[PDB]
Amino acid sequence: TQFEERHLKFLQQLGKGNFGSVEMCRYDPLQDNTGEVVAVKKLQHSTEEHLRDFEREIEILKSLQHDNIVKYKGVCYSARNLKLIMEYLPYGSLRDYLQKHKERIDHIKLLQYTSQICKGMEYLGTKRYIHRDLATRNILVENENRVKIGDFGLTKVLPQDKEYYKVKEPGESPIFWYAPESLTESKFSVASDVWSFGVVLYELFTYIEKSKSAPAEFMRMIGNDKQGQMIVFHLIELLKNNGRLPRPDGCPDEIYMIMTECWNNNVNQRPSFRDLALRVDQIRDNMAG
Ligand SMILES: Cc1cnc(Nc2ccc(N3CCN(C)CC3)cc2)nc1Nc1cccc(S(=O)(=O)NC(C)(C)C)c1
Ligand SMILES: Cc1cnc(Nc2ccc(N3CCN(C)CC3)cc2)nc1Nc1cccc(S(=O)(=O)NC(C)(C)C)c1
Ligand SMILES: [Cl-]
Ligand SMILES: [Zn+2]
């Protein structure tokens, strides 16, 4: 569908990166506040080089149709301040949702979200797309039973002849948990996306930790703000466990085994998303029956 810039009413700013920003807006052509609340992505700097990259991102999202991938609604043109219109997911990032509503999340629920991430990611690989920044930050919550991969700003299309994508520039990327070959050789692949998911899996089973323990006790103790404090906690746990991520308290051995496998140093020795989803689904079925 088509959208007119003048009918987009600003409500709240959701996120700000170095290249773009996402705002919570109402598309109100009737001018009576009855309009639909949408998520709007815009460029921080409007240049031909930035517009070409944004157009590639829009074309990637438009080509994706899956239950665990944020819905594309349309675009907002002018000539040339291009804006991407998406559905608004009200519960925000999985990172924030887990911390705010841990009291109502159990292992059956964490596994449901895990399967959903895995399925969304396997669909991504189907189109030969590399996410490059899979995080609990960009996995968003529609409701208590559905999560979606909500940002594709760093998504690359794999060359037909190669199984990796080499980024020939360091850049100011929000990527933190680099796979060994992405840091050393700048190579991004499905295997590096699998590395990124292992960390996501670890975080999920960390936020669930019963009450007042290690993740809650840390966030209390610190005398600063948010977002960057969560990596500080993980860096401490990593430092306490000889450089390798520990098994979160209460985490089943089966899920830790999956974490471990995703963190294999060798590219070709990491599990696939399809098999990961199938494995997670078996664990969930055994918990129920
Ligand atoms: C496409 C989309 C749909 N719904 C929502 N919902 C949303 C997201 C974040 C919040 N947070 C913002 C921060 N905090 C104060 C709590 C609420 C709330 C709702 N967000 C969407 N996109 C999005 C919003 C913020 C951040 C991200 S992002 O993926 O981290 N990437 C950039 C834009 C920051 C670079 C993506
Ligand atoms: C953004 C960033 C930039 N440089 C480095 N360098 C780095 C960090 C730790 C090591 N370690 C790994 C563990 N080992 C026991 C000692 C050296 C080596 C290089 N790390 C960064 N992030 C990061 C921090 C902690 C862990 C991880 S990671 O996701 O485990 N991936 C790496 C270490 C294989 C790259 C990534
Ligand atoms: Cl400590
Ligand atoms: Zn610029």
Swiss-Prot record:
Q: Where is the active site?
A: D133 (proton acceptor)
Which BP terms does GO give this entry? Answer: actin filament polymerization; activation of Janus kinase activity; adaptive immune response; apoptotic process; axon regeneration; cell adhesion; cell differentiation; cell surface receptor signaling pathway via JAK-STAT
Cellular component annotations (GO), alphabetically ordered: caveola; cytoplasm; cytoplasmic side of plasma membrane; cytoskeleton; cytosol; endosome lumen; euchromatin; extrinsic component of cytoplasmic side of plasma membrane
Give the modified residues of type Phosphotyrosine. Y27, Y123, Y129, Y164, Y165
- Post-translational modifications: Autophosphorylated, leading to regulate its activity. Autophosphorylation on Tyr-27, Tyr-123 and Tyr-129 in response to growth hormone (GH) are required for maximal kinase activity. Also phosphorylated by TEC. Phosphorylated on tyrosine residues in response to interferon gamma signaling. Phosphorylated on tyrosine residues in response to a signaling cascade that is activated by increased cellular retinol.
Where is this chain's protein located in or outside the cell? Endomembrane system; Cytoplasm; Nucleus
Q: Which domain of life is it from?
A: Eukaryota
UniProt GO MF annotations: acetylcholine receptor binding; ATP binding; growth hormone receptor binding; heme binding; histone binding; histone H3Y41 kinase activity; identical protein binding; insulin receptor substrate binding
Which proteins does it associate with, and in what oligomeric form?
Answer: Interacts with EPOR, LYN, SIRPA, SH2B1 and TEC. Interacts with IL23R. Interacts with SKB1. Interacts with STAM2. Interacts with IFNGR2 (via intracellular domain). Interacts with LEPR (Isoform B). Interacts with HSP90AB1; promotes functional activation in a heat shock-dependent manner. Interacts with STRA6. Interacts with RHEX; this interaction occurs in a erythropoietin (EPO)-dependent manner. Interacts with ASB2; the interaction targets JAK2 for Notch-induced proteasomal degradation. Interacts with MPL/TPOR.
The UniProt entry's sequence similarity note says:
Belongs to the protein kinase superfamily. Tyr protein kinase family. JAK subfamily.
Q: What is the name of this protein?
A: Tyrosine-protein kinase JAK2
Source species of the chain = Homo sapiens (Human)
Q: What is the lineage of its organism?
A: Eukaryota, Metazoa, Chordata, Craniata, Vertebrata
Full protein: residues contained: 842 to 1132 of 1132
